Chains A and B, each alone.
Chain A
Amino acid sequence: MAITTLSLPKGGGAINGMGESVGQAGPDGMVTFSIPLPFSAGRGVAPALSLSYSSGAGNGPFGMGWQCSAMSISRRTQKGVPQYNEDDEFLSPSGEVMAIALNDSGFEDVRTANRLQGIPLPFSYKVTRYQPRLIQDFIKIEYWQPVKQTDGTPFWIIYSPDGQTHILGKNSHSRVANAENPSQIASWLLEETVTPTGEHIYYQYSGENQVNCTDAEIALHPQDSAQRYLARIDYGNISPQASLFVLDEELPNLTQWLFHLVFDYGERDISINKIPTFEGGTTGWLARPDMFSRYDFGIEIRNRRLCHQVLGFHRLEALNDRDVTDEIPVLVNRLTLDYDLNNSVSTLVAVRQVAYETDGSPITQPPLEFDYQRFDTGSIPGWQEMPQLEAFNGYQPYQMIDLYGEGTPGILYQETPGAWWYKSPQRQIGGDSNAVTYGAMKALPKIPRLQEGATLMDINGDGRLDWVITSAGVRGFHSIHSTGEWTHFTPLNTLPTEYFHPKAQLADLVGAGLSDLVLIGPKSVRLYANQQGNWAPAQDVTQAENVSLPVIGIDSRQLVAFADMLGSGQQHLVEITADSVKCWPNMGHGRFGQPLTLEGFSQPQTSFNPDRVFLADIDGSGTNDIIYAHSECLEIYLNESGNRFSKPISLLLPDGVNFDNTCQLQAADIQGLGIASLVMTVPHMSPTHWRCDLALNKPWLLNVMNNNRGAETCLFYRSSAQFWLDEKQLVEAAGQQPECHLPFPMHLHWRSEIFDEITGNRLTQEQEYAHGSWDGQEREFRGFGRLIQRDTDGFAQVDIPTHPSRTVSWFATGIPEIDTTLSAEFWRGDDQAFSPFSPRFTRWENDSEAGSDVAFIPSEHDAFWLNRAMKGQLLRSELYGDDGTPEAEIPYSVTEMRHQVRALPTTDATVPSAWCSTIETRSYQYQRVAADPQCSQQVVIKADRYGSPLLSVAINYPRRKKPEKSPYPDDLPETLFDSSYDTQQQQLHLTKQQQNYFHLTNDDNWLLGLPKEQRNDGYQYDQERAPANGFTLETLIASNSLIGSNQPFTYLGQSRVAYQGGVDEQPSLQALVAYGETAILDEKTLQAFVGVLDSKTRDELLFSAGYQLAPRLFRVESEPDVWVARQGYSEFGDYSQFWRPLSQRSTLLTGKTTLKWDKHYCVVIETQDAAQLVTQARYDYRFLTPYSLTDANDNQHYVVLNPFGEVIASRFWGTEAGKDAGYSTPQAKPFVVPATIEAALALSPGIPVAHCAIFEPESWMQKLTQHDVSERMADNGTLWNALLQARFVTEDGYVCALGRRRWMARHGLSVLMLTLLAEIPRTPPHSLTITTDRYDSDDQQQLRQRILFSDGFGRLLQSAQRVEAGESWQRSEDSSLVVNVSGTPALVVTDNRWAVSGRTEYDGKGQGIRVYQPYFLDDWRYLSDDSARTDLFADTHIYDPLGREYQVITAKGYRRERQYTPWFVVNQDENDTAAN
């Protein structure tokens, strides 16, 4: 490293986009995609927010499934309504459970304090260091409560290992709190952070308000005051402060922060043809069609707003430090956030980067565009008969549950003692792996099953069923496994509530999965009592007497239910008449909110028998929908966002059928599809059953990703129950026993295609998984036992035979009964490979020597928690590729890991906290030959209470015995197979590396594990030294370890750093280096000198080379000193100078260098070296970037940039020995770059500039407008306007990329939408440039007329340069070759000749197969892929599954060939290969 020089520009590049690709597989299997926000770093202190979609998410201002949350710390409530007292529980921002820590004296972290960072506080706080149950990394938490509640509010502080330090929720805007008693706070938002540089970021929120809020919004949702949204962030503080700005009695002015992020929720004019105002205007933030509300805390949230635009602002004349009045920051760039809207949901259609020209024009990037699989009412299929069930319903003949945990119910007809006969869901034979059927019944041993309050209820909430015993005086259950293991009887610490009656028996409001009875009606509320399948006392409560009273059981054209119209998940009380609906907000224990009416339902009061209604949610949101029977038709009412109801869909029944009091309608997932179908019996005829597959796909899944550059995707998704049906099919084909315990049909990613819009090639990738896993005690997901991926491209081309990818992997579920079995799944063609790793359970000890862990035997509890901690650790993976060869059954390689779990003490008398560690790693490189892998392993030995990697060892194993005969082909010269060996292959090697650290870890400093010292050494051994199963931890620690303290070695290195700081060159809080240090020469190395030198000449050469002797690191007693280098000598400002680097000197032997910074200490304005070579620069603070430079000779360079900060023109000029040379000064001769390629081709030479460039990122899309088409169709431009709302065309008039499909297809509308395109061919995103070879004072000025083309991603596709006129091939306007009558490329003279360069065709992984030769062209525009494939010469690179060329073909069939083995690689040329 050396000086950050003032930099001469490179002058060019290639077109960008953003974050274009989704990651690989994971044991969640969930679809997600994400990109960081495109906004400036400032001085390197700027926020890390990102857009993200996940199929796992709920709803928010980002739109459904979208997510860009700031960091916040919060209560924990998924068990149910919190207490708002001592007994409350809380969660880390990462999402982890939190508990009171212990001090190392063996007592809790209680103290009181009267200062913060030692800044004295106005009043004292009780303060507590806080401990998560599981560490990801050792961030420190302290919570802060007033010593008495009158003394303000509690708040939170966070300390990073890198010392970045953060405060949450000191103020109400940064706090989410009970609107009607703010003494209760739910969450503390990130409010400020501080760096050791005294730099900060500050976060400004807003609450809700009645801006654009209706009467109904007030009447139903008055108590909005709890809600918050992010209004602004600001950063680049002008004054440094090592303490928090919150410690100011008032926060400094907006002007004190020089960079601002402004969030706008549709307030400013959303039109692009105007620069946004910094202020918002009179709109305010908008409304939305689809406001939701949440009650997840026993209190309301109401959610009215969505973004539309976000704006980045730099305080320009402050940053320039040139003016102080009226500091209007300029908008550097505007993010557009563009949404699809519906009365129940909204989500992004698109997003764009935008910036604004000095004339006020927008300039725009090509959008990124989305689509989602979505609900519909138009397409619904006709009903279908159900032979499988066709009569077996209508009172007794139906019985059903998923006893087996299929994720799908089985029809368990049961009639008498024993009649338990499970007609079971089976795959149909043939067809797609979607077809399913109920197979025949089976009998299994079972309870006497009667007189008992019979029911297959899971009483415990396991997800797995018991059967209820409640006969006179007789009370308990059995439990039944998926195996059908009816466990022995269970008395229950039995204390169920007395069953007066079932009348109004409650279930849900105790908390999800915790259900318990309450018998209740007006003016009173009994309490539920169930915990985990036992019970509390059934206490009494009431809500306030004003609250309207819900009460079940009157038939008078009316109904009541526990069913969530609202779709929060709480199955709220709802009451229904012939004419109206009312629903009561969940309020937890003994309590309800005043009910809300839901508008829209009604039916003729003359005839509304209540039971003709059916209850299901249909839209998939959570909002319970409504169905009502006419004898000929269904009326289907869909819930608008949980607020009111759509116009009812009217559905014709099966032909000739009539619905009647015998008929039983239902909805179910007999499809296993994860979205239900209507299912019905009509017990009139012998056949009775019917279904409608209303839902074709689960809605609300982001199913297409695109950018208008040319990236587009098809995305595919599948039910876990379907995967398990495939598994069960194979399990019974093996006759194995089903214990894939996962009682829920989660639905997950399956397949995706990425299609290159340009070349028409594509990439196929698919995944599968097995042993879906569940926590039967905590009631939570535990992953899959196994994951699998496969992949190929698809090719426009037979020249590429694919040889498809496979890989398989295994991960910790944390369930021994499963986890054990996974070992049996492993490939074992080799068997000399070592026996596996295993998880090391260990306890940390402050051992009164230095601290250590100690491995130990957990109890059954501890083991449960520790395995739950190992949850998700990667255990193993196994790599393959498939072809015609009998070794696709052999891996290329295999990988395996050992983990160790550290337990930690707690105030929690029930469980410890934990941390997990990846203590060993090993791999075998097979190259698909099982016999003779290369093998290597890497291991850790020493770590502290903070787990630093103090000592490591790594191993490379000796070769196996020479093979008994060639596993390799016969083509080899046979001697090779006897020759390819060395004793070195039998030499075992081990490697030692060891290190230690500083810990400024006290008060408000939390600087964990700062680098202090490091050393390297190495070992070598004979094969016969190899331990029996290779090494493990237990091998490497041993007294007889090959790297134990007895064992001599070659020393190989050491390194150190001297800090500048308060003592002993120990780190400052800023831990600035004083110098770096490394070892260079050693006693053994000196023996090279011994042939020439002597002591004096040696020493003087060393000292003149600048080295010195120093203590050798980790020297135990007697080791010699060693020669070291010391480096990096540099100096820095104080905190007031933001510790900015003022000077640097790589070594004291060299001349120094000197730095000069702006007043904000942001920019190095100017510099000089110690030979006194000056360099100068002047800066565009839009971009923190020099628009000017001056060299030490006082030659200027100058450059100008677009609103995004793209370099677009440049020039240089200066001094020339009694003359001034280069171009003119810019202000002496101004210029502006032309708008288009043709506008540039119109230019003369003699321009006063070194360069300019032009770009089209949008070139891929056609741009279409009223001008022409109004003649052709003259529909008064109504299309011309409405195609935006149709999103066929953008606001800037480009054909929108998904739009092109969207509006042509949706109703097959006008063929014009295609007809008017190709007169502009879709043109690869491209640039043109000129640079000028001579000064504009010479009328000879050569112009480098050059163009370049890139894909929808950033891959360079091709380039060209204009050349002198002459013979050339000829392009067609449709991009075809022009050709002669014989189809020969039209080789003819042209004036407009180009040389074409760099073209190739590429794998999706970018590998160029066909690398083409150079050719002439007559045109700048692109030449077609089809014609290129037809005529143009290329060599063809041929890639293995790792992506290595095992062959290349010439353009004329001769080849270079290479073949890979673990120990050697074979190579063959075009002549030897001509044997083929």
Chain B
Amino acid sequence: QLFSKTPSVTVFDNRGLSVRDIAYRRHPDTPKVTEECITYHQFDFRGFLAQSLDPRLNHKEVTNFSYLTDLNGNIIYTQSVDAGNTLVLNDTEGRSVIAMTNISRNGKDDLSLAVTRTFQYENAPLPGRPLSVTEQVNGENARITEHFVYAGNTPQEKNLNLAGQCVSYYDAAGLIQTDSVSLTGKPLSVSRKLLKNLDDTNILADWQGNDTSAWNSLLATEIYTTVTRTDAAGAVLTTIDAVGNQQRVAFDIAGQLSASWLTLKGGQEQVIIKVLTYSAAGQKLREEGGNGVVTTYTYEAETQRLIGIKTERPNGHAAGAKVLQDLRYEYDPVGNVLSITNDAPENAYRYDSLYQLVSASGREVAGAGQQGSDLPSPLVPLPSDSSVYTNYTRTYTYDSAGNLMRIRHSAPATNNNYTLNITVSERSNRGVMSSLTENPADVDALFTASGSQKCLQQGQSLIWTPRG
């Protein structure tokens, strides 16, 4: 039991501020060696965060993070080599006036990708909610991403319980007409309009033009709706789904699900559940699926930890009587999984004191080869015999700052072996498969100002777009 003397500790200034914190680390591969991992929180003249950093960049004596605020309150401006920068502002009421993102790491960071969001509002007498907000693209095609319609107090609205409601929200991909409500507060209905052709990537769902006399050019004919009724407790009593489906449900005295039925598109509604039953912990205990297969659940009564779950087919069933699974799990005192087994046989694990799962072992299928950007073939038919799967070891490696190094494996009887690197930045979390580059200085160019990645694969470019 490795874990003896691996505590964590937090440290404070005379203002009681959380100046520093420590975690002890120890790989079971390194049982004689204990690492001390630490990071810092500098505080300002205001008694608030001045600086806090990546441990490894810090101990390499590089500074890479920033956080800046109003007179008290909250961050105005904030940067990392990972995140890029970020700026906002909001009202005295906290209503937002502006936000910006995807701004680079030089004198000043690059505002040309700021993807600016700004907001338009209810005015006197109305309470002051935003009636719209827009993507105010810097120096470019600024476009109104969304628009809110708030109802009045007509008797119609009152009956629909839509008084003051956001009875429309036009948005990216179109509009929700918040088009009726029950006195419980749950909807009586909503209508969704998708775009005039949701196929057409360049009808933008940006609400240029003054009203739907224009925006009809941007909303579908393929409009759909949901209609609903509910408990006084608000749980669903029934529902309708305009393509042709529909819903009904029933419950136990504590509100737990007993049974349910759903109308299939344009046709019958039929029962789902055959049995469903629960523990004193309220968690499931005894069930039977609509196909008639039977399940039960098992807990440590001292702790409610699930020790296992078991399932079988009944006598004379269409697929015949059979135990389908008997899941059993092995835990450390904290509860980390040490091993698992099932029958219808085993696997096992290792951890650092810091609970990095450093090793895993068990059965995996032969012949799939080294995992890449792919899904290999299923075995067909379903294997009647077990030797098609084989022993493996799988292992992993990590930084004292929050980064990984390599992944390392053998399935020896298959001869499938690898060790594979994520190249990671000399000065950030940015990192990629070795295939893209092996060089930790070069890797950080493979990312956007937000730090979104350029590519999936050697040429598989990632089309990042405004609003990230």
A-to-B contact residues, CB < 8 Å: 934-936, 956-959, 971-973, 975-976, 979-982, 984-985, 987-989, 1018-1020, 1049-1053, 1079-1082, 1085, 1087-1089, 1091-1092, 1101-1102, 1104-1107, 1125-1127, 1146-1147, 1149-1152, 1169-1174, 1192-1195, 1212-1218, 1221-1222, 1250, 1331-1335, 1340, 1342-1345, 1361-1364, 1366, 1395-1396, 1413-1416, 1433, 1450-1452, 1454, 1463-1475
Contact = CB atoms under 8 A, between A and B. Distances in A.
Contact of A1052 (B72, B180, B303): B72
Nearest to B285: A1366
B391 interface: no
Given A1149-B93, A1471-B332, A973 B183 contact: no
B285 to A, nearest CB: 9
Interface in B166-201: 180, 182-183, 188
Given A1362-B253, A1464-B11, A973 B161 contact: no
Contacts of B232: 1212, 1222, 1250, 1332-1335
A1192 B4 contact: no
Nearest to A1104: B97
11 contacts: A989-B15, A1050-B46, A1085-B69, A1089-B77, A1092-B100, A1149-B92, A1149-B128, A1171-B127, A1216-B161, A1466-B7, A1469-B3
A1215 B153 CA distance: 13
A984 B13 contact: yes
B189 to A, nearest CB: 9
Given A984-B19, A1104-B97, A1170-B124, A976 B183 contact: no
A1422 B3 CA distance: 43
B240 to A, nearest CB: 14
A1161 B440 CA distance: 74
A1105 B232 CA distance: 40
Contacts of B89: 1101-1102, 1105
B125 A1171 contact: yes
Interface in B46-98: 46-47, 68-73, 76-77, 85, 87, 89-93, 95, 97-98
Contacts of A1463: 11-12
A1216 B9 contact: no
B374 interface: no
B152 A979 contact: no
A1471 B68 contact: no
A981 to B, nearest CB: 7
A1396 B253 CA distance: 15
A1091 B153 contact: no
Contacts of A1217: 159-161, 180, 182, 188
B380 interface: no
B128 A1150 contact: yes
Given A1149-B93, A1333-B233, 7 more contacts: A934-B14, A1050-B46, A1085-B76, A1151-B128, A1340-B250, A1464-B12, A1470-B334
Given A1080-B73, A1469-B3, A987 B183 contact: no
A1318 to B, nearest CB: 29
Report, as a range, how many residues of chain B touch the other chain.
35 or more
A1125 B4 contact: no
Interface string B253-296: 11100000000000000000000010011100000000000000
A1080 B69 CA distance: 11
B388 interface: no
B301 interface: yes
A956 B336 CA distance: 43
Contact of A1363 (B6, B76, B109, B253): B253
B370 interface: no
B221 interface: no
Interface in B1-43: 1, 3-17, 19-20, 22, 24, 34, 36, 38, 40, 42-43
Which residue, of A1080, A1150, A1194, has the highest number of chain B Cβ atoms within 10 A? A1150
Interface string B320-354: 00000000000011111000000000000000010
A1096 to B, nearest CB: 13
A1081 B73 CA distance: 10
Q: What are the 7 closest A-B residue pairs judged by CB atoms, nearest first? A: A1475-B4, A1151-B127, A1088-B76, A1471-B3, A1050-B45, A1088-B68, A1470-B333
A1395 B252 CA distance: 13
A1146 B124 CA distance: 13
A1394 to B, nearest CB: 9
Interface in B211-234: 231-233
A1052 B8 CA distance: 34
B203 interface: no
B234 to A, nearest CB: 9
Contacts of A1107: 92
A1471 B1 CA distance: 8
Interface of B: 1, 3-17, 19-20, 22, 24, 34, 36, 38, 40, 42-47, 68-73, 76-77, 85, 87, 89-93, 95, 97-98, 100, 103, 108-109, 111, 114, 121-122, 124-128, 150, 152-153, 157-161, 163-164, 180, 182-183, 188, 231-233, 235, 237, 250-255, 277, 280-282, 301-304, 332-336, 353
Given A1080-B71, A1395-B280, A984 B42 contact: yes
A929 to B, nearest CB: 15
Contacts of A1470: 332-335
Nearest to B8: A1467
Contact of A979 (B36, B163, B277, B281): B36
Nearest to A1222: B183
Contacts of A1361: 253-254
Contacts of B10: 1464-1465, 1467
B3 A984 contact: no
A1193 B163 contact: yes
Given A1092-B111, A1106-B91, A1087 B254 contact: no
A931 to B, nearest CB: 15
Contacts of B150: 1171
A1468 B6 CA distance: 7
B5 A1475 contact: yes
Contacts of A1332: 232
Contacts of B280: 1395-1396, 1414-1416
Nearest to B119: A1104
B159 A1106 contact: no
Contact of A1174 (B9, B153, B157, B231): B153
Contact of B87 (A1019, A1091, A1104, A1170): A1091
Given A982-B20, A1092-B87, A1469-B3, A1052 B46 contact: yes
Contacts of A973: 5-7, 24, 34, 36
Contacts of B69: 1085, 1088
Contact of B9 (A959, A980, A1362, A1414): A980
Contact of A1472 (B7, B20, B126): B7
Contacts of B76: 1085, 1088-1089
A1172 B161 contact: no
A114 B24 CA distance: 83
Contacts of A1127: 92
A1473 B334 CA distance: 10
A128 to B, nearest CB: 50
B70 A1467 contact: no
Nearest to A1017: B45
A1018 B45 contact: yes
B77 A1192 contact: no
A1172 B152 contact: yes
Nearest to A1149: B128
Q: Tell which of B1, B93, B253 has the most Cβ of chain A within 10 Å.
A: B253
B93 A1345 contact: no
Nearest to A1472: B3
B71 A1085 contact: yes
A957 B14 contact: yes
A1362 B85 CA distance: 55
Given A1018-B46, A1450-B303, A982 B13 contact: yes
